[PDB]
Design a binder for this molecule. Structure first.
Ligand SMILES: CCCCCCCCCCCCCCCCCC(=O)OC[C@H](COP(=O)([O-])OCC[N+](C)(C)C)OC(=O)CCCCCCCCCCCCCCCCC
Ligand SMILES: CCCCCCCCCCCCCCCCCC(=O)OC[C@H](COP(=O)([O-])OCC[N+](C)(C)C)OC(=O)CCCCCCCCCCCCCCCCC
Ligand SMILES: CCCCCCCCCCCCCCCCCC(=O)OC[C@H](COP(=O)(O)OCCN)OC(=O)CCCCCCCCCCCCCCCCC
Ligand SMILES: CCCCCCCCCCCCCCCCCC(=O)OC[C@H](COP(=O)(O)OCCN)OC(=O)CCCCCCCCCCCCCCCCC
Ligand SMILES: CCCCCCCCCCCCCCCCCC(=O)OC[C@H](COP(=O)(O)OCCN)OC(=O)CCCCCCCCCCCCCCCCC
Ligand SMILES: CCCCCCCCCCCCCCCCCC(=O)OC[C@H](COP(=O)(O)OCCN)OC(=O)CCCCCCCCCCCCCCCCC
Ligand SMILES: CCCCCCCCCCCCCCCCCC(=O)OC[C@H](COP(=O)(O)OCCN)OC(=O)CCCCCCCCCCCCCCCCC
Ligand SMILES: CCCCCCCCCCCCCCCCCC(=O)OC[C@H](COP(=O)(O)OCCN)OC(=O)CCCCCCCCCCCCCCCCC
Ligand SMILES: CCCCCCCCCCCCCCCCCC(=O)OC[C@H](COP(=O)(O)OCCN)OC(=O)CCCCCCCCCCCCCCCCC
Ligand SMILES: CCCCCCCCCCCCCCCCCC(=O)OC[C@H](COP(=O)(O)OCCN)OC(=O)CCCCCCCCCCCCCCCCC
Lengths: 50, 140, 98, 69, 53, 55, 347, 101, 459, 120
């Protein structure tokens, strides 16, 4: 590519978003356990959020 | 120097002006003697007379500062009937600073010494009241 | 405790105050330093011999050897500054104030 | 906008609960460590602040040249 | 830092001199062998803070 | 009067002059070993007698 | 000087330091100290000019006095305990004498009068060897005897060292004297935090060693010994100006550089023991060290002082000095703050 | 005498002299016109317009509209049954133990 | 918050690998893209904050400041590229690198959940600004300005570090989410008095308080244009954010320990506005106006009421935008006439009419013309201070009169009257300067349509 | 502080109890940051010797990164071990001394009393 310097920054934003999602999955200790949002799981799914 | 500080702080404040003044004068004279000893050691004088004159001048200045501070703080505690109050020590510290200005014969250093040593004396009074530790023993 | 201990401590203190107040010469400072070592020798030797510590009897020999090597180095330094200035006065060693 | 970019309120709620639990655990552990350090310094019976002493494996036990020892 | 090279390597460079109640030549006893032995048998393994009291 | 003269005088200028004067007093040594060792003896005497650091 | 004789003398210096570090006998500590000093004397007199002999004479006299005081403390401890194991001392007089002997060897105030003159009189490499390596052994001996150290004495020595070092370094224009006063202030910090947590002392010692090594290595790389000769560097090699700027900013403890970490952890440790006035006073006093560091950065990197004509002749030639480990200690002295929890390896 | 060797102060360059169509961005006309296009497109057409559109359609910022709807529901429910619309105490006094004096 | 940190550090290889002529285009383009991306932080809730991780969070107070920072960076890139035209390429890349690093520290500062991480970033912001001021400033006394700025900040901030470590050791945590629920009353004693002083003096210096403001008409004046923009627009608001975060731990001792600074800042704004009335320098006049507005914010934070907090955050954002625009206009005049004297170049409306219109709009927003967010913030602070006490309305009315006086004095002196005869290098306005002015003006005018996104966490 | 712990088995970088702990991953962020430190030192080494910074001597920069990664990995192993030892000693001492660490009588907010200071 002759314009890779123009794709340095958006792939940085995409990688930062991916790391944010990974850490959000890492902080899932109270998923579907809170006293306000506790509910029975609808079928054909396993988690409330990812 | 440990017994001088205890004998100064053993007297209740606003009670005995003469003994408090004497203790403060002794502490000041000791500090002035230390300063004069280091002065004649590092900066050697021209003769014995110049060195003993410098020693007497420094010791007398420090002793006068101590006596004025002790007398002023004790008198202000007596008049106001407020023994545990850093305002009395602030007044005494400014009196000591004005004495230092009188000894050096310049107004500006005297006013600056009034402000700074009044603040320092007030801080020492707050530390004595609240039990602040400067050389704190290891604990954890 | 004993009395000769007090005399050896006072001898060490006298030699220390002699070293710590230079008069004119560097050689007098070196002599005061080596008198301090000699007082250390006597004190340690008396303590070791009175305590019957057998294996500590080798210590004053090592102390003497090391401090005499120290004194040899000091004499060499004195000879160097005497060759520089023509005398061993301590008032000529003041170039490093600036 | 709320479907593509934004996060669900439940996700933020439970994420905040997880963060709060972890940080409260850390704060309690820090306070307990301070108290333990103070007690070990004061008493000296714990695994910390064990300043060394003379090892007793160096003492000679064979009979000497003099009986009175 | 006190790097215990002697204990790591197993050598004995200065432990023979370090106390008076140690192994002395020709089994010569010291004047205070028994007192020092009792004090060492106290202080061993309890740290300085406990052994000071 | 206030911010070009006095507010400049109280906090920064006086502190700067005090540190300058203390620096000129500290670094004005004459480079003599005899005076340094006399100061060492005075320090030892003050610590032993006046401050009681050997207790 | 012969390369082989220089090698043997340098290994003798390190052997003396090792003998002090690894030994369990007080006489061996003394022996290592004299071996180290006797071997390091010819490093100071490498150039053979009167200033080097004067500096060597003052250094020899100070170290011999401190050594005799150390032997006195050892003999008093033997008299009152009957043993020689390097551990806590059994007499307050022996503890006071040994503490002042180690303070004289470290050059802390008020025993500080020999450090700037000795550093000025000797070359840059020998001054680096002195101010970096000579302080590993007295701090180890202090690390071994902390149950016997008087708290008031060591704290007085610390605060006096910090104040005197800052006020002394305010007035200097020679780089070696600036480095000496900076050293005095840093040893004040290190022995201030000694009695509460000696691991913080080890961390501060390591960080100060790295920063001083970087600054001295840059100095000998550019062959500058004064302020103005350092200010000529912008017209010769501007990368060195950037390096001295970042290292002098890190030496002042400015975050987020690696020099912030020692005083940060020291203040963290001192407040756990309910000592609040002293860490504030030490920070306010370290502002003076920051002041003369920032003055150096003004003269060197952030302005362009006038140069001379022969700088062109110096442009036409590249450098060939063996700037050993200069990028490594340049990186390690500036970007080490995110790895702050690495200090647990020193406990 | 004559002072140190130093160049005089250079004359200020007029950007409109060599390029009367200058936008003031660069001395090369192509770089200058491309910088103008970049700033005008990505600043006004992209950030300002779509940013205003994004802020205008924020999904119920800080729950104000939900709070109004819930207040309507609660006011209707409390008005229908004769209940007071709001009480002076946020928590029930039954589940609160006052200190004994 | 990693989705904004990582593109910011990826701006560094973008400016260090670009061509000799394409550094400004690339940096401006990609910073504008990240500024557009920064709008995703507006997912705020009426009860809970937007908590991303253990280290980062962003409530409704830090979000406007973040958006302001990430929008301000391309403005500084556009402004600072004319006076760096003849500079060496490596020095140009170093300048852009310091701007990028400052933006990185600023966006890590507003989102720090831990207070000691906030302190570390808040004092890491000192180095790039000091380097920018003392290296690319034009005058002799830029070194003295840097010394004053650095030492005022550090002397104010070292007791803050000591007090924060004390709070960590006493309470067990410095996490702001924990401290909202674990907070305790602070009783009246001398220890707590010096706790309050230590926790407050750093942000009182950085804001600045009247009497501690002596570094501002130096650092704001001897800096380059980008430095002046980032000093006026963002760096003064670190103190405001710090007092908003730290007042939670200082109750109920604030209600009487806030009296001397309330009297200092109520009387201080009159003194600084009067100073503005008799200023021969345009840049110094703008700096003293900044001192007065930040004194208003200080009073609003210190009286600690909801209306005061909303007015304080709105006034902070509005004054940042207005001061940045005023500094840009003064810089354009400086590039035209090569002098900062206000009386030298006069009557520029006959020569520069659209620039005169931009000057008029900036002056109108400076004196809080409704319904600008300047007036919204100033009005809310005035209402809350009236609730505090009634003679505050006398003080606020006097301040408003003098503020209108000096703003129109600025405008009438610079733009109106007869033009200077001997000045003949007044070039027409470039497209770059006009684009910079419009990018300062249009967000400021658009925010009056939806002012609810700048009203803090208790709107 | 912990010399009594590190006194029975001296001069060991990692004792045999450390092998019961999970080793750091090779994708550790601290290890990646140390590798970045090595790369930065390689670039400075190119810069001070007037070489092209990003092109000259790729073997030198690779050895810089490799050496930094190696030393950092072992330092991280030691750091994790020593924090593990700290926690282990803390919990053992807490469990062994129940008299000094009593259970705090937790009370709900309906029983506790807090003074109210109005903001007016
Ligand atoms: C920009 C210039 C102006 C800067 C002003 C900076 C703030 C001014 C006040 C700072 C005081 C020092 C930090 C105090 C931190 C207190 C934390 C704490 O726990 O406090 C309670 C603690 C209480 O001690 P404690 O918490 O250990 O004890 C437990 C509590 N009691 C007492 C109940 C048992 O306070 C202290 O320890 C002392 C506090 C007062 C310290 C006085 C000395 C400093 C004087 C002011 C110096 C200001 C800067 C001067 C230099 C300027 C530049 C040249
Ligand atoms: C935000 C914190 C950081 C601050 C700095 C930010 C810098 C970066 C800038 C990014 C982009 C801008 C962000 C802020 C955008 C603010 C504007 C916005 O979105 O508003 C939304 C608001 C939203 O309004 P609303 O909330 O009432 O709309 C209801 C909501 N919906 C749409 C879902 C139903 O938009 C409007 O108000 C537009 C209304 C229509 C257009 C205007 C009509 C009237 C115009 C004037 C007519 C003549 C009057 C008389 C004139 C006389 C002469 C003077
Ligand atoms: C009141 C009594 C004060 C006595 C102490 C001061 C004495 C003094 O100044 O002595 C002068 C002496 C220097 O003598 P000088 O003349 O320079 O020598 C050349 C040959 N005449 O200076 C010295 O010898 C300096 C050291 C004098 C002793 C200092 C310690 C004791 C006094 C202070 C503590 C009590
Ligand atoms: C009071 C007074 O008379 O001060 C005069 C003195 C200088 O003395 P001189 O006037 O030379 O005789 O001057 C001095 O001693 C110095 C100034 C005295 C203290 C002035 C304190 C207030 C200054 C304004 C503070 C504003 C904030
Ligand atoms: C800027 C400078 C700020 C200085 C802040 C100092 C804070 C106070 C510390 C000293 C103090 O007053 O301590 C109180 C203490 C009396 O209380 P306590 O410790 O119980 O003493 C009895 C002995 N067990 O008092 C003592 O122990 C003796 C008195 C100490 C006085 C120190 C100051 C002397 C004058 C200035 C030098
Ligand atoms: C108080 C601290 C000192 C304690 C011991 C004092 C011993 C008596 C000294 C009196 C003062 C004599 C004096 O001025 O000594 C200075 C002298 C160096 O000066 P110099 O060059 O010889 O001549 C200039 C004289 N002003 O220096 C000397 O002559 C030093 C001689 C020291 C001799 C000490 C003898 C033992 C003293 C009692 C035990 C301690
Ligand atoms: C409110 C805060 C008030 C205090 C802020 C800090 C001090 C004031 C600002 C920094 C110093 C300003 C300055 O430049 O002072 C000039 C003065 C002389 O500078 P000089 O070296 O002669 O000039 C170089 C060539 N023109 O410089 C000096 O005399 C040096 C002064 C150094 C002071 C450093 C800060 C020390 C703070 C702790 C003291 C304990
Ligand atoms: C708890 C801690 C326990 C202990 C841990 C380990 C501590 C390590 C302490 C390191 C101390 C370094 C001392 C100074 C360097 C020693 C080597 C030497 O002699 O260097 C000088 C030598 C002189 O040669 P010459 O050619 O005359 O130089 C003049 C310039 N032409 O050669 C030169 O001048 C050549 C030029 C380059 C010299 C570079 C020297 C760098 C040394 C420091 C490296 C970084 C520190 C060590 C690693 C971190 C340790 C914490
Ligand atoms: C210079 C540049 C421009 C200005 C910049 C800012 C400078 C001022 C910043 C600090 C202002 C002073 C500190 C805040 C004081 C607020 C009022 C207060 O609480 O005063 C203390 C005290 C009030 O008396 P009382 O209530 O009896 O105290 C007992 C408390 N347990 O008051 C008294 O008793 C009277 C005073 C006694 C001495 C106080 C010394 C400590 C405080 C100053 C440091
Ligand atoms: C890079 C580091 C390379 C280390 C190689 C191994 C050396 C070694 O065996 O070190 C042992 C030492 C821990 O031994 P220990 O006796 O527990 O510590 C006493 C310190 N007060 O280990 C350590 O101290 C590890 C940390 C050494 C760091 C040295 C450079 C800074």
């Amino acid at each position: 590519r002759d314009h890779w310097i123009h794709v340095l920054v958006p792939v940085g934003f995409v990688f930062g978003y991916y790391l944010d999602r990974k850490n959000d999955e890492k902080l899932a200790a109270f998923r579907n356990k809170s006293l306000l949002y506790k509910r029975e799981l609808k079928p054909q799914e396993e988690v409330t959020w990812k | 120097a440990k017994t001088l500080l205890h004998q100064y702080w053993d007297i209740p404040e606003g009670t005995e002006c003469h003994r408090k003044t004497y203790a403060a004068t002794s502490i000041g004279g000791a500090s002035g003697l230390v300063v004069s000893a280091y002065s004649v050691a590092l900066k050697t004088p021209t003769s014995f007379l110049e060195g003993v004159a410098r020693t007497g001048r420094y010791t007398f200045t420090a002793a006068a500062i101590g006596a004025i501070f002790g007398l002023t703080s004790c008198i202000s505690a007596q008049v106001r009937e407020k023994p545990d109050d850093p305002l009395n020590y602030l007044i005494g510290g400014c009196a000591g600073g004005l004495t230092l200005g009188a000894r050096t014969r310049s107004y500006g250093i005297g006013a600056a010494a009034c402000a700074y040593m009044g603040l320092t004396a007030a801080l020492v009074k707050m530390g004595q009241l609240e039990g602040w530790k400067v050389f704190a023993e290891p604990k954890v | 405790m004993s009395l000769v201990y007090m005399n050896i401590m006072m001898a060490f203190t006298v030699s220390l105050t002699g070293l710590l107040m230079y008069r004119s010469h560097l050689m007098s400072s070196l002599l005061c330093l080596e008198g301090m070592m000699l007082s250390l020798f006597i004190l340690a030797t008396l303590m070791i011999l009175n305590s019957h510590f057998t294996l500590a009897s080798m210590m004053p020999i090592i102390l003497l050897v090391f401090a005499a090597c120290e004194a040899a180095l000091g004499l060499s330094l004195l000879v160097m500054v005497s060759n520089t200035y023509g005398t061993d006065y301590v008032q000529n060693l003041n170039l490093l104030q600036c | 906008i709320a479907r593509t970019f934004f996060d669900a309120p439940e996700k933020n709620y439970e994420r905040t609960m997880a963060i709060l639990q972890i940080e409260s655990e850390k704060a309690e552990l820090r306070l307990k460590e301070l108290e333990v350090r103070r007690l070990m310094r004061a008493k000296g019976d714990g695994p910390w602040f064990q300043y060394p002493t003379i090892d007793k494996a160096l003492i000679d036990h064979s009979p000497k040249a003099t009986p009175d020892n | 830092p006190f790097f215990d090279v002697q204990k790591k390597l197993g050598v004995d460079l200065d432990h023979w001199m370090t106390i008076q109640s140690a192994e002395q030549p020709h089994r010569i006893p010291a004047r205070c062998h028994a007192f020092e032995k009792e004090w060492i048998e106290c202080a061993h393994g309890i740290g300085s803070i406990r052994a000071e009291k | 009067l206030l911010d070009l003269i006095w507010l400049e005088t109280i906090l920064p200028k006086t502190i700067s002059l005090a540190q300058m004067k203390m620096s000129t007093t500290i670094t004005s040594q004459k480079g003599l070993i005899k005076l340094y060792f006399l100061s060492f003896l005075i320090t030892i005497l003050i610590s032993t007698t006046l401050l009681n650091f050997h207790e | 000087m012969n390369p082989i004789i220089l090698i043997i003398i340098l290994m003798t210096v390190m052997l003396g330091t090792i003998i002090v570090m690894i030994s369990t006998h007080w006489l061996l500590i003394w022996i290592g100290f004299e071996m180290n000093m006797l071997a390091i004397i010819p490093i100071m007199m490498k150039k053979h000019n009167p200033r080097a002999t004067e500096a060597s004479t003052k250094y020899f006299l100070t170290q011999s006095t401190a050594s005799m005081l150390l032997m006195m403390a050892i003999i008093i401890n033997l008299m009152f305990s009957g043993q020689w194991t390097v551990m806590k001392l059994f007499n307050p007089m022996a503890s006071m004498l040994m503490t002042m002997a180690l303070a004289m060897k470290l050059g802390m105030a008020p025993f500080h009068f020999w450090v700037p003159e000795v550093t000025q009189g000797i070359p840059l490499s020998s001054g680096l060897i002195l101010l970096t390596w000579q302080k590993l052994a007295p701090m180890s001996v202090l690390y071994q005897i902390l149950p016997s150290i008087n708290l008031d004495l060591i704290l007085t020595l610390s605060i006096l060292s910090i104040t005197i070092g800052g006020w002394g370094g305010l007035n200097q224009t020679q780089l070696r004297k600036i480095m000496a006063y900076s050293s005095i202030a840093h040893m004040g910090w290190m022995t201030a935090v000694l009695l509460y947590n000696p691991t913080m002392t080890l961390l501060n010692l390591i960080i100060y060693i790295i920063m001083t090594s970087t600054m001295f290595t840059l100095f000998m790389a550019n062959s500058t010994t004064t302020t103005l000769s350092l200010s000529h560097t912008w017209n010769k090699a501007p990368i060195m100006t950037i390096l001295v700027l970042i290292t002098l900013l890190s030496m002042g403890g400015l975050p987020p550089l690696s020099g912030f970490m020692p005083k940060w952890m020291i203040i963290q440790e001192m407040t756990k023991n309910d000592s609040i006035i002293l860490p504030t006073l030490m920070a306010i006093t370290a502002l003076l060290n920051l002041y003369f560091y920032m003055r150096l950065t003004y003269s060197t990197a952030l302005t362009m002082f006038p140069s001379t004509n022969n700088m062109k002749m110096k442009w036409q030639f590249p450098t060939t000095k063996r700037m050993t480990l200069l990028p490594t200690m340049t990186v390690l002295s500036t970007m080490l703050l995110p790895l702050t929890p690495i200090l647990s390896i020193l406990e | 005498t004559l002072r140190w060797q130093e160049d005089p102060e250079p004359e200020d360059e007029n950007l409109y002299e060599k390029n009367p169509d200058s936008h003031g961005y660069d001395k090369d006309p192509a770089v200058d016109v491309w910088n103008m296009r970049v700033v005008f497109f990505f600043g006004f057409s992209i950030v300002l317009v779509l940013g205003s559109t994004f802020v205008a359609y924020l999904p119920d910022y800080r729950m104000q509209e939900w709070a109004r709807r819930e207040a309507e529901r609660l006011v209707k429910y409390r008005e229908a049954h004769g209940l007071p619309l709001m009480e002076s105490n946020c928590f029930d006094p039954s589940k609160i133990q006052l200190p004994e004096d | 918050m990693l989705k904004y940190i990582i593109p910011t550090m990826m701006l560094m290889p973008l400016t260090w690998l670009s061509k000799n002529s394409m550094i400004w285009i690339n940096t401006t383009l990609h910073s504008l893209l990240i500024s557009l991306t920064s709008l995703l932080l507006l997912n705020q809730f009426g009860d809970n904050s937007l908590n991303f991780s253990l280290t980062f969070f962003s409530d409704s107070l830090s979000t406007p400041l973040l958006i302001l920072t990430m929008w301000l960076l391309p403005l500084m890139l556009m402004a600072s590229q004319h006076h760096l035209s003849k500079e060496n390429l490596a020095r140009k890349k170093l300048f852009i690198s310091m701007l990028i690093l400052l933006q990185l520290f600023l966006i890590m500062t507003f989102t720090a959940t831990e207070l000691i991480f906030f302190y570390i970033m808040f004092e890491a912001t000192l180095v790039p600004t000091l380097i920018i001021i003392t290296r690319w400033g034009n005058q002799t006394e830029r070194l003295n300005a840097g010394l004053y700025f650095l030492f005022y900040t550090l002397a104010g901030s070292l007791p803050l570090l000591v007090a924060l470590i004390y709070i960590q050791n006493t309470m067990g945590s410095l996490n702001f989410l924990i401290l909202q629920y674990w907070v305790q009353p602070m009783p009246n004693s001398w220890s707590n008095t010096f706790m309050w002083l230590a926790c407050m003096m750093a942000f009182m210096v950085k804001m600045p308080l009247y009497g501690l403001h002596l570094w501002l008409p130096k650092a704001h004046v001897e800096a380059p244009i980008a430095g002046s923009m980032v000093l006026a627009a963002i760096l003064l608001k670190l103190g405001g954010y710090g007092m908003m975060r730290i007042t939670l731990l200082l109750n109920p001792i604030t209600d009487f320990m806030a009296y001397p600074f309330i009297m200092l800042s109520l009387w201080g704004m009159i003194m600084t506005s009067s100073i503005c009335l008799r200023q021969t320098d345009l840049k110094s006049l703008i700096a003293y106006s900044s001192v007065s507005h930040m004194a208003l914010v200080i009073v609003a934070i210190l009286i600690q009421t909801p209306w005061s907090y909303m007015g304080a955050t709105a006034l902070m954002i509005a004054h940042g935008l207005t001061s940045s625009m005023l500094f840009c206009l003064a810089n354009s005049n400086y590039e035209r006439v090569h002098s900062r004297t206000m009386i030298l170049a006069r009557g520029l409306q006959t020569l520069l009419p659209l620039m005169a219109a931009w000057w008029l709009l900036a002056s109108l927003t400076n004196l809080a013309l409704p319904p600008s967010i300047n007036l919204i913030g100033e009005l809310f602070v005035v209402m809350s201070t009236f609730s505090w006490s009634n003679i505050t309305i006398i003080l606020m009315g006097l301040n408003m009169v003098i503020t209108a006086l000096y703003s129109l004095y600025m405008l009438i002196t610079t733009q109106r009257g007869k033009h200077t005869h001997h000045i003949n290098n007044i070039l027409p306005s470039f497209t770059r300067e006009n684009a910079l002015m419009s990018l300062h003006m249009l967000p400021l005018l658009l925010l009056s349509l939806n002012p609810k996104i700048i009203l803090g966490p208790l709107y | 502080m912990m010399t009594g712990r590190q006194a029975r088995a001296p001069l060991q970088f990692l004792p045999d109890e450390a092998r019961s702990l999970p080793p750091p991953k090779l994708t550790d962020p601290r290890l990646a940051y140390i590798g970045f430190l090595g790369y930065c030192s390689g670039l400075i080494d190119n810069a001070i010797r007037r070489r092209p910074v990003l092109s000259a001597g790729l073997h030198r920069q690779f050895l810089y990164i490799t050496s930094f990664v190696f030393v950092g990995y072992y330092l991280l192993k030691r750091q994790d071990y020593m924090y593990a030892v700290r926690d282990h000693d803390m919990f053992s001492y807490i469990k062994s001394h129940p008299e000094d660490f009593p259970e705090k009588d937790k009370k709900t907010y309906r029983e506790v009393f807090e003074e109210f200071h109005p903001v007016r």
